[PDB]
Ligand binder design. Structure first.
Ligand SMILES: Nc1ncnc2c1ncn2[C@@H]1O[C@H](COP(=O)(O)OP(=O)(O)OP(=O)(O)O)[C@@H](O)[C@H]1O
Ligand SMILES: Nc1ncnc2c1ncn2[C@@H]1O[C@H](COP(=O)(O)OP(=O)(O)OP(=O)(O)O)[C@@H](O)[C@H]1O
Ligand SMILES: [Mg+2]
Ligand SMILES: [Mg+2]
Lengths: 156, 200, 156, 200
C-alpha cells in the first residue's frame, strides 16, 4: 500500500542513514554528494539484475569490507480492504506475517564480505517483526520477491 | 448448436457459483480442464485457483494436461490443500507460540474422539490423529478453528485464491461442507462444485 | 576422481546425446556441428557466471520451449583413499550419498520454460541414484556446487 | 629473540595433539581464540575445524570475537553439533526411511530409561525422552551407533573435519568420551581439552 522508511547501513557514501518515505519521492542535492547511490540501494534490494552480481570492494564504507551491508525497507499495509497491491504482497509471502503485527511489513538485505574468494553475497529476508526475519524462499535463480515487485530504471 | 454446446455456453460464460449434478462418466474431466483453461484465459490479474480432488493421480493427470505455469495455482487433493495452505503456516498463529510448527501426518494410530483431548495430543505428543467416528473430521474442524481464530489465514485465502475447483463432492462429511460454506459465504469466494448425485 | 558420462537432452542441437568421458577429453569435428555447444553445456552446469543469466528461447531444441532441458554428469568416485579431490567432493555434499551406492555420483541440471516471464530457470540437483535427486542447497547467489569446482575458460 | 620467542615458536607452531594443564577460566578464552585464529591463519587447504561449548552465551561471545568465517567452521554446543552433523543427514541412510528426518528435543514428558523402549518410541511416537539416570546420553549413543553403522558418515567427517576444540570437560559423561575416542582413534581428529587442577 505505502512505503514508510528506508534504513541504509555501511553502503558507499552512507554510514547509517534513515530516510522517511512515501509514495512519490523526490531527491535533490549537490554534486558528488550521493543522489545516485540512493537509487542503487533500491536496485540492489528490489531488482534482480543488479543483485545477481553481488558486491565488490568499492561498495563498502571507506573500502573497509569488515562491516555488514544492511538495507531495510518498511511497508505500511494498513489498508487490506480496497487495495489490490496489499493482496499482491500477501498472496506470495504466506507465512511470515503475524496477527499482532498485521499492519507492518519489512524487507531486508544483508551482506558480509568473504575476503578469500573476494565476493559479497547478498541474502534477502522478509518478515513482520524486525527480529526473526526468515529468508525468502526460492528455487534456482528466482526467489519469491521477484514475483511481487518490478523495477523500471530510466536514465537518459 | 444443440444441448451439449448450449450447456457448454451456459457453463463457460457464467462466472458465478456453479453447481453441477451430472451422471456417471460423460466427461467431467474435460469440462473441468476447459473451465479451468477458460478461467485462466479470462483472468488478467494475479489471482489463483485450487483444484481439489480425492485421488492424487487424477490431479496429476490434470496437471499433465494443463502444464507448467508461474501463477502459483494449486492442483491436488483435499488433504494436501488443508495440510499445505491452512494448518502448517498458521498453526503457530492460531493456537499461540507454544504450539509446534512442523508435524507428520499420521491418522492411523490415534482414535480419540474429543476436541480438547485432541488439542492436548497435538500439543504434547506432536502427532495429528483423527476422530473415531467416520462422520467427523478432526483435521477439517482444526482448519475451521484456524480460519475462525487467525486473521492472517483469512487474508491469505481471500488474497490468494479466487475460485476453488472441487471434484467428487458426494463423499464428503458435514465438516467439509461447513468449511466450504465458511469459505463461500463469509470470505465471498466463488465456488465450483461438480459431482454425481447417488449412484453408489 | 574421474568423469564418466554426460547426458545432454533438449539443448541447442543435441536432442538426446550420451557421451562417455574421462579426464583429458579432446572433442573434434566439422564446422557448425556443435563443438562449442558441448562446452557451453559444461559452462551452464559448472560455472556460475554463465548460469546466472538463465536460458533464452534459443537455448531449446528447434525453438520449441515445451520440453525440459536436462544435463546430467556422472562421476566415478571409486578411489576414496589417496585422492584429495574425492574428499573435496564428499566434504561438501554430506547428505545425498548412500553407502550402498558409494561409488557413483550424479550432478543434474533441469530447466522448464515459463512462457509468461519469458525465462528459463535453471535448477541444479545432485544425488547418488538417478531417482531421488535432491536440490543443491544454497543461500543468496551462491550454492554448494561453486564450492567444489572452478572452471577456467580459455578462448583467444 | 631468546627464550620468549623460542617458547612462542614452541606453543604456536604445534601440529599434534594438545593437552594443556591449565585451570578453568583465567584467560583461557583469549588463548583459545588466539589458537583458533592461528589455526585459521596457518591452514590453506579445504579442511574445516569444529568448536564445542556448553552454554550459548560463551558461544555467542566466541562468535563475537571471531566475527565472520567462510570456511564452513562450526562453533556451537555438543547437542547441536551431534544433531546437525551426525544424526539428521545420516539417520535415513543408517536406519532406513521409516524414521523421520525432522525432530525436536522435548524431554519434559517422557522419562523412559531403557534403550529398547526409546527406540520403539522413536519408531512409533517419533519423540525422544530422557533417562531417569542423569548421567546418560541417548543422543550420543545414537550418534555412536549410526557412526558405527554408516560408511558415508565416516567418509564425510574424515573428509571435512580436521580438529575439535573442546571446552568444559569437567562435567561430562563417559558416552561423550567414548564417541570422542571413536573419532580420535580411527578417523584421525586431534583434540583440544581444557580442564581443572583439582575437583571444582
Ligand atoms: N565506497 C565508497 N566509499 C566512500 N565514498 C564513496 C564510495 N563510493 C562512492 N563514494 C563517494 O560518493 C560520491 C559519488 O558521487 P555520486 O555520483 O553519488 O554523486 P551525485 O550526488 O549523484 O552527483 P551528481 O548530482 O553530480 O550526478 C563521491 O564523493 C565518492 O567519493
Ligand atoms: N536453439 C537452436 N536450435 C536449433 N539449432 C541450433 C540452436 N542453437 C544452435 N543451433 C545450431 O547449432 C550449430 C551451432 O554451431 P557451433 O558454433 O556450435 O559449431 P562448431 O562445431 O563449434 O563450429 P566451428 O567448428 O565452426 O567452430 C548451428 O548448426 C546452429 O544452427
Ligand atoms: Mg547522480
Ligand atoms: Mg566451435
Amino acid at each position: 500500500m505505502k512505503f514508510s522508511n528506508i534504513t541504509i547501513k555501511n553502503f558507499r557514501n552512507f554510514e547509517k542513514v534513515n530516510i522517511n518515505l512515501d509514495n512519490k519521492n523526490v531527491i535533490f542535492g549537490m554534486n558528488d554528494i550521493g543522489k545516485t547511490n540512493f537509487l542503487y540501494a533500491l536496485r540492489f534490494l528490489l531488482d534482480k539484475e543488479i543483485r545477481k552480481f553481488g558486491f565488490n570492494k568499492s561498495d563498502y564504507h571507506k573500502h573497509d569490507t569488515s562491516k555488514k551491508i544492511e538495507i531495510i525497507l518498511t511497508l505500511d499495509l494498513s489498508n487490506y480492504e480496497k487495495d489490490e497491491d496489499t493482496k499482491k504482497l500477501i498472496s506470495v509471502v504466506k507465512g511470515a506475517r503475524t496477527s499482532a503485527n498485521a499492519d507492518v511489513f519489512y524487507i531486508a538485505l544483508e551482506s558480509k564480505y568473504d575476503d578469500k574468494e573476494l565476493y559479497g553475497n547478498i541474502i534477502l529476508k522478509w518478515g513482520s517483526e524486525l527480529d526473526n526475519l526468515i529468508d525468502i524462499p526460492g528455487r534456482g535463480n528466482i526467489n519469491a520477491l521477484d514475483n511481487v515487485f518490478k523495477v523500471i530504471y530510466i536514465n537518459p | 448448436m444443440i444441448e451439449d454446446e448450449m450447456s457448454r455456453e451456459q457453463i463457460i460464460k457464467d462466472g458465478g457459483n456453479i453447481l453441477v449434478t451430472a451422471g456417471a462418466g460423460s466427461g467431467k474431466t474435460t469440462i473441468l480442464v476447459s473451465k479451468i483453461e477458460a478461467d485462466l484465459k479470462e483472468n488478467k490479474t494475479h489471482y489463483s485457483i485450487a483444484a481439489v480432488t480425492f485421488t492424487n493421480k487424477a490431479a496429476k493427470e490434470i496437471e499433465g494436461r494443463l502444464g507448467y505455469s508461474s501463477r502459483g495455482n494449486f492442483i491436488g487433493t483435499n488433504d494436501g490443500f488443508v495440510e499445505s495452505e491452512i494448518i502448517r503456516p498458521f498453526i503457530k498463529d492460531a493456537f499461540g507460540n507454544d504450539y509446534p510448527d512442523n508435524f507428520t501426518a499420521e491418522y492411523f494410530d490415534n482414535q480419540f474422539a474429543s476436541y480438547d483431548k485432541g488439542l492436548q495430543v497435538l500439543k504434547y505428543q506432536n502427532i495429528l490423529g483423527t476422530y473415531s467416528n467416520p462422520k467427523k473430521n478432526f483435521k477439517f474442524q482444526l482448519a475451521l478453528d484456524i480460519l475462525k481464530k487467525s486473521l492472517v489465514a483469512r487474508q491469505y485465502i481471500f488474497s490468494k485464491y479466487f475460485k476453488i475447483f472441487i471434484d467428487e463432492y458426494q463423499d464428503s462429511d458435514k465438516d467439509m461442507h461447513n468449511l466450504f460454506m465458511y469459505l463461500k459465504d463469509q470470505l465471498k469466494i466463488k465456488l465450483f462444485i461438480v459431482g454425481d448425485p447417488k449412484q453408489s
